[PDB]
Design a protein around this ligand. Structure first.
Ligand SMILES: CN(C)c1ccc(C(=C2C=CC(=[N+](C)C)C=C2)c2ccccc2)cc1
Lengths: 186, 184
């Protein structure tokens, strides 16, 4: 498919050279298409990227769907999910493209609203854990909406802003966070 | 010089590091490519100088603001709330992270940004150490907790820019509550 070929080539280029450095010209020549056609299917480079992110996020959800069954309780799922977010983002080849993209279009309303919709599927994973945990007596949380967003934003701050490298140490700090956080809810 | 510093800081906040070009700085600061050179030499040296000043200002602000909080528990709530409102340092985080995910190899400037992040972390260290001394909680690894708090708060600040300010303060106070209640 010529739309899927552009998505695939765009992905490789965004992996290889990041979001900023990659031009529509490159995507177009390696896809064997034209800017006119790229514009047709995705309007902008920004929107091509969001489409890739949406396909990637769907794959992340399916991975969590099966990876979570190895965790009996919702307390364990919260530990696991946070650890998984950390370790996945440590090697994820699009991670740098994602950082460049976000750090440029986070104040841009029309794109930043679509970013929010992607981010809210992460908050939704926390909502399930926390709701379902209420239902089984693991904790008692009144505002699951608020706590899910807090957890989502806190966990990803630790992931993104930690320059205290060594992956072993990063995993320990994330587990310490998860302990303190869940202890605070009891 | 200060015209270059002002427009840079603002373009960096708005577009990030990469998307901000020197030509645009000198276009909007009414200067030359050769005037930015001499004052700052390179684009990244300008940025790093902005960061040093931003951290200075943030630190002035907190030194003056922390007196209003008597207990270290209260200093932690306030510090975190202020991080949402301050004009200093925190508005540049996306730019800082973008810059870090490029010149992390270049150990000449990497080392200078480690010293900047150590300051950003040491405020929590003081809070948590002093809270230990004043019996507000027991923390056996303050260095780890300070790092977790700093980065967790930064994430709540940085990833919620899209919201009503009072709501963001409500989200942050809850976090603050949960976190300190998790130390007990
Ligand atoms: C590949 N992978 C596992 C991930 C990839 C990206 C994210 C992110 C994120 C941060 C906060 C969010 N919130 C607060 C909803 C949502 C996403 C994210 C990290 C840095 C820059 C922009 C977004 C997380 C996981």
């Amino acid at each position: 498919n010529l739309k899927d070929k552009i998505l695939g080539v765009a992905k490789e280029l965004f992996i290889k050279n990041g979001y900023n450095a990659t031009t529509t010209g490159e995507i177009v020549k390696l896809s064997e298409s034209s800017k006119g056609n790229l514009y047709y299917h995705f309007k902008t480079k920004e929107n091509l990227f969001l489409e890739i992110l949406n396909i990637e996020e769907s794959k992340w959800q399916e991975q969590w769907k099966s990876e979570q069954i190895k965790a009996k309780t919702n307390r364990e799922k919260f530990y696991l999910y946070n650890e998984l977010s950390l370790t996945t983002e440590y090697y994820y080849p699009l991670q740098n493209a994602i950082i460049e993209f976000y750090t440029e279009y986070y104040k841009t309303n029309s794109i930043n609203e679509k970013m929010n919709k992607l981010q809210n599927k992460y908050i939704d994973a926390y909502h399930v854990i926390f709701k379902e945990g209420n239902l089984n007596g693991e904790w008692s949380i009144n505002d699951v909406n608020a706590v899910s967003k807090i957890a989502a934003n806190a966990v990803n701050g630790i992931v993104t802003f930690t320059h205290e490298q060594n992956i072993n140490e990063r995993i320990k700090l994330m587990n310490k966070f998860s302990q303190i956080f869940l202890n605070g809810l009891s």
